[PDB]
């Protein structure tokens, strides 16, 4: 995956030269194909103040196949399950080689600000987001304080 490696090195370098405001990321160890990333809950959302860790596993065909991105921090959300798996189209069918890990992480932040109740990876939480925002925001706030702060 040398061409994948060259592109991973470029994304890494771009993060250093122009640090984005929504994420911090880098290799876990000496293997550029495995990263750890940190995002914070978007401002004025139920996840505000929380730090959420994610793993990023690049494929050898990168950037022509998406990276495997999963939450390691526990989070209350209809599109993220207890295994940290994320239901997000750009990580599956809508991936594009013009996308970067940084752009994907910003989309995940956008998904925290506006969950998608029509892709219920956790049906119960999706029903509550539709039914009762107050209850949803309470549970999402509590899991943030419990697991992400």
């Amino acid at each position: 995956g040398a061409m994948a490696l060259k592109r991973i090195q470029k994304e890494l370098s771009d993060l250093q030269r122009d640090p984005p405001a929504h994420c911090s990321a880098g290799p876990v160890g000496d293997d550029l194909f495995h990263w750890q990333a940190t995002i914070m809950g978007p401002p004025d959302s139920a996840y505000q103040g929380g730090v959420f860790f994610l793993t990023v596993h690049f494929p050898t065909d990168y950037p022509f196949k998406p990276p495997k991105i999963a939450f390691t921090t526990k989070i209350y959300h209809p599109n993220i399950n207890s295994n940290g798996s994320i239901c997000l189209d750009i990580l599956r069918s809508q991936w594009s080689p013009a996308l970067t890990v940084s752009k994907v992480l910003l989309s995940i932040c956008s998904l925290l600000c506006d969950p998608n109740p029509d892709d219920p990876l956790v049906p119960d939480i999706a029903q509550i987001y539709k039914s009762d925002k107050e209850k949803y925001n309470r549970h999402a706030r509590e899991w943030t304080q419990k697991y992400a702060m």
């Binding site: 880098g26 978007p42 103040g49």
Partner: protein
């Protein structure tokens, strides 16, 4: 001996600090409190996706001139 690093607040602006490689992460938090008034126990410092431990030094993390840390405060 002294050097400059950047601290990027999540969803926020960039702080500049003058530090030494021997400064602890806790020292850095105290410096952030000097400039911003944020108490250390509400700060978490991040580098390249990893949370920095309060007792270690910038040297231990090989953090050098003009590197950028991230500050989570809540």
């Amino acid at each position: 001996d002294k050097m400059q690093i950047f601290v990027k607040k999540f969803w926020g602006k960039t702080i500049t600090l003058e530090v030494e490689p021997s400064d602890t992460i806790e020292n850095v938090k105290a410096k952030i409190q000097d400039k911003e008034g944020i108490p250390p126990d509400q700060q978490r410092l991040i580098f390249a996706g990893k949370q920095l431990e309060d007792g270690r030094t910038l040297s231990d993390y090989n953090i050098q001139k003009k590197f950028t840390l991230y500050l989570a405060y809540g």
